[PDB]
Design a protein around this ligand. Structure first.
Ligand SMILES: *C(#N)C1=NC([C][C][C]N2[C][C][C][C][C]2)=[C]C(C2=[C]C(C(F)(F)F)=[C][C]=[C]2)=N1
Length: 215
């Protein structure tokens, strides 16, 4: 469709994951944006290791939460991130066991979308690929999402408490959206995904903490 993109159809997006009981959403957001850039740069991707991030990004709080920017900084400084197959997800924080022989991607830094600018976010998604985004995911209504374009007037754009991955944008039945990849399993939402309101005054803080890795 004109003025839309869906990166899942272009091979930039791996299967939806389940973080389990661990607060590693940021590690799944981060590996997601890295996966997209792997495909962009090399023509192929593989699953990258969230557990590598949870365990080794000491600036974040493991299963207590974190920021995607810190993970990108880590992959750059560490000269790599392992594959999921080299360093599998266990759902709790463990000692850092990074080994460069399982290295599957690299990072030369990151950029942040100007705060609150959805138009800038759309150009990022159009010109880069999948972009890491933070949202207010606290509402009951967010959690019980199944179909349509999500909008709730109660969403607080200043309460950013959950990390997700913007993998496209479009319009459905006259409602502009972002295609959002979550890490609560394929059972959640619509096969792991949520369509969130686009251009509805930065609904849920969608454009407030957006970043992508340079590769
Ligand atoms: C993700 N996952 C995640 N987890 C946490 C800790 C657990 C939060 N809590 C939410 C309600 C129900 C059960 C558990 C914290 C964060 C977090 C993420 C961000 C970011 F901006 F990066 F999106 C900011 C603050 C906290 N994410």
């Amino acid at each position: 469709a004109p003025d839309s993109v869906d990166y899942r159809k272009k091979g930039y997006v791996t299967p939806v994951k389940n973080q389990g009981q661990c607060g590693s959403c940021w590690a799944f957001s981060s590996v997601g944006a890295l996966e997209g850039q792997l495909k962009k740069k090399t023509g192929k991707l593989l699953n990258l290791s969230p557990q590598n991030l949870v365990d080794c990004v000491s600036e974040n709080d493991g299963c207590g939460g974190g920021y995607m920017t810190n993970a990108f900084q880590y992959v750059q400084k560490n000269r790599g991130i392992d594959s999921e197959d080299a360093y599998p997800y266990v759902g709790q924080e463990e000692s850092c066991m990074y080994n460069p022989t399982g290295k599957a991607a690299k990072c030369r830094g990151y950029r942040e979308i100007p705060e609150g600018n959805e138009k800038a976010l759309k150009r990022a998604v159009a010109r880069v690929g999948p972009v890491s985004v933070a949202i207010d995911a606290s509402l009951t209504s967010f959690q019980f999402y199944s179909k349509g374009v999500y909008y709730d007037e109660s969403c607080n754009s200043d309460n950013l408490n959950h990390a997700v991955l913007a993998v496209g944008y479009g319009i459905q039945k006259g409602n502009k959206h972002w295609i959002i990849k979550n890490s609560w399993g394929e059972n959640w939402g619509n096969k792991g995904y949520i369509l969130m309101a686009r251009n509805k005054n930065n609904a849920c803080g969608i454009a407030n903490l957006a970043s992508f890795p340079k590769m």
